[PDB]
Design a protein around this ligand. Structure first.
Ligand SMILES: *[C@@H]1O[C@H](CO)[C@@H](O[C@@H]2O[C@H](CO)[C@@H](O[C@@H]3O[C@H](CO[C@H]4O[C@H](CO[C@H]5O[C@H](CO)[C@@H](O)[C@H](O)[C@@H]5O)[C@@H](O)[C@H](O[C@H]5O[C@H](CO)[C@@H](O)[C@H](O)[C@@H]5O)[C@@H]4O)[C@@H](O)[C@H](O[C@H]4O[C@H](CO)[C@@H](O)[C@H](O)[C@@H]4O)[C@@H]3O)[C@H](O)[C@H]2NC(C)=O)[C@H](O)[C@H]1NC(C)=O
Ligand SMILES: *[C@@H]1O[C@H](CO)[C@@H](O[C@@H]2O[C@H](CO)[C@@H](O[C@@H]3O[C@H](CO[C@H]4O[C@H](CO)[C@@H](O)[C@H](O)[C@@H]4O)[C@@H](O)[C@H](O[C@H]4O[C@H](CO)[C@@H](O)[C@H](O)[C@@H]4O)[C@@H]3O)[C@H](O)[C@H]2NC(C)=O)[C@H](O)[C@H]1NC(C)=O
Ligand SMILES: *[C@@H]1O[C@H](CO)[C@@H](O[C@@H]2O[C@H](CO)[C@@H](O[C@@H]3O[C@H](CO[C@H]4O[C@H](CO)[C@@H](O)[C@H](O)[C@@H]4O)[C@@H](O)[C@H](O[C@H]4O[C@H](CO)[C@@H](O)[C@H](O)[C@@H]4O)[C@@H]3O)[C@H](O)[C@H]2NC(C)=O)[C@H](O)[C@H]1NC(C)=O
Ligand SMILES: *[C@@H]1O[C@H](CO)[C@@H](O[C@@H]2O[C@H](CO)[C@@H](O[C@@H]3O[C@H](CO)[C@@H](O)[C@H](O[C@H]4O[C@H](CO)[C@@H](O)[C@H](O)[C@@H]4O)[C@@H]3O)[C@H](O)[C@H]2NC(C)=O)[C@H](O)[C@H]1NC(C)=O
Ligand code: NAG
Lengths: 154, 51, 51
């Protein structure tokens, strides 16, 4: 639904990003890629966090972030579909899970699918980006068993 | 009210009344020409989300 | 006969609503004049009572 996200952000008219500090205990933060070169260093999207395995252990991620301010918040989250199974073991250290983001009303469940795709910039894997809007009273919860491109803020 | 059949939802919404929220059980097996939903409508039952 | 609708249960914790973390998703199916509603379920089915 690329058109919907584009029209939404354009209508809002601000790219203002407030950084937030989530739990993220037990997983390796940041993350790098060869295609996303930034200042001659391998890198990733500025507003996205590539979570990877820590000590070959990926605990279930149950991270809650509330809204106490009086404005609606837009969260950008993603699911990483790996090209190969070798890569899944290398990066997340377990099998494919399910990524579910949830609020009082909206709940989105995406299942990673591992398969080779036409290589773009020599990268066979892909990432699917979704958006979640959190109301003031509502709270955001994620159940990640891997393959989660987590938000860095709102 | 006249001449169109008006049904006042009171503390209810149409989907909630269709499903059978207890407070809405009054509207069961009723017909309408125009259904009216109040802003104060609230649900008192298992969290329901309808795609 | 005309269409198939398949939904897979997703088990996970979700923000508490009315002190109930679990949720229920509701879908609708239309049955034509001569048709059959066939339901295959191994679990997690909130079932209809009538039409
Ligand atoms: C960021 O995220 C972290 C989570 O990573 C979060 O901190 C958690 O908070 C919850 C809620 O209090 C804690 O859950 C409690 O668990 C208590 C038992 O803890 C034992 O087990 C822990 C897990 O060990 C696993 O891994 C080891 C191998 O490493 C393995 O052997 C085990 O079998 C198991 O698989 C372990 O980390 C923990 O060690 C810590 O113990 C205390 C802190 O509890 C302290 O001495 C140290 O910090 C030490 O590292 C211990 O061995 C349990 O008692 C408790 O249950 C009571 O409270 C609940 C809630 O009130 C009641 O419902 C219940 O009835 C009991 O009364 C509770 O379940 C969890 O352990 C924390 N995780 C930690 C500390 O790492 C932070 O809050 C997050 N931060 C932010 C800012 O969001
Ligand atoms: C995924 O992450 C979520 C995080 O939300 C976990 O789910 C809930 O976690 C919270 C945090 O502990 C639990 O909160 C519970 O609140 C209940 C009371 O309800 C409210 O009542 C009044 C009226 O609105 C409020 O003012 C009040 O603040 C409460 O919010 C109680 O069950 C507990 O509250 C406390 O009650 C007494 C009195 O203070 C204390 O003695 C208790 O020890 C208790 O701390 C509790 O805090 C909530 O229970 C969780 N939901 C559940 C369990 O279904 C998920 O569990 C997590 N998923 C996992 C771990 O798999
Ligand atoms: C998000 O959704 C996921 C998926 O449902 C949940 O994540 C985990 O899901 C598994 C489902 O099996 C949970 O259950 C099992 O935990 C068992 C406990 O192992 C404990 O063993 C000793 C006690 O003897 C403890 O000391 C130790 O620390 C462990 O905690 C394991 O036995 C399970 O692995 C095995 O399960 C079956 C059992 O036969 C077999 O098929 C396999 O042998 C398999 O290896 C499994 O891990 C698990 O507890 C869930 N994690 C958590 C943190 O709860 C999330 O819960 C969910 N998030 C939510 C709800 O917030
Ligand atoms: C992975 O590496 C990143 C760093 O690239 C790290 O995330 C950063 O963590 C720090 C500390 O929690 C955050 O705070 C920043 O710290 C740096 C230190 O150099 C400061 O320069 C920052 O201030 C600038 O940035 C602010 C936000 O734009 C501005 O408002 C301010 O005016 C300054 O320009 C800030 O204090 C930091 O935001 C993140 N992110 C980044 C991109 O730095 C992460 O912790 C590392 N992960 C692991 C597992 O080690
Ligand atoms: C509807 O809400 C009002 C709130 O003032 C309450 O007084 C009334 O009892 C409610 N009616 C029902 C049927 O729950």
């Amino acid at each position: 639904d690329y058109a919907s996200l584009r029209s939404l952000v354009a209508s809002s008219g601000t790219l203002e990003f407030n950084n937030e500090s989530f739990n993220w205990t037990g997983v390796t933060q940041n993350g790098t890629s060869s295609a996303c070169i930034r200042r001659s260093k391998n890198s990733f999207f500025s507003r996205l966090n590539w979570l990877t395995h820590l000590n070959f252990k990926y605990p279930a991620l149950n991270v809650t972030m509330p809204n106490n301010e009086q404005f609606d918040k837009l969260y950008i989250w993603g699911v990483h579909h790996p090209g190969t199974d070798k890569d899944q073991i290398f990066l997340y250290a377990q099998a494919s899970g399910r990524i579910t983001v949830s609020t009082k009303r909206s709940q989105q469940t995406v299942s990673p699918n591992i398969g080779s795709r036409p290589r773009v910039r020599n990268i066979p894997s892909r990432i699917s980006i979704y958006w979640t809007i959190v109301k003031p009273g509502d709270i955001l919860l994620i159940n990640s068993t891997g393959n989660l491109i987590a938000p860095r803020g709102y | 009210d006249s001449p169109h059949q008006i049904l006042d939802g009171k503390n209810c919404t149409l989907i909630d009344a269709l499903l059978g929220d207890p407070q809405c059980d009054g509207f069961q097996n009723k017909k309408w020409d125009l259904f009216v939903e109040r802003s104060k409508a609230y649900s008192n039952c298992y969290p329901y989300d309808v795609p």
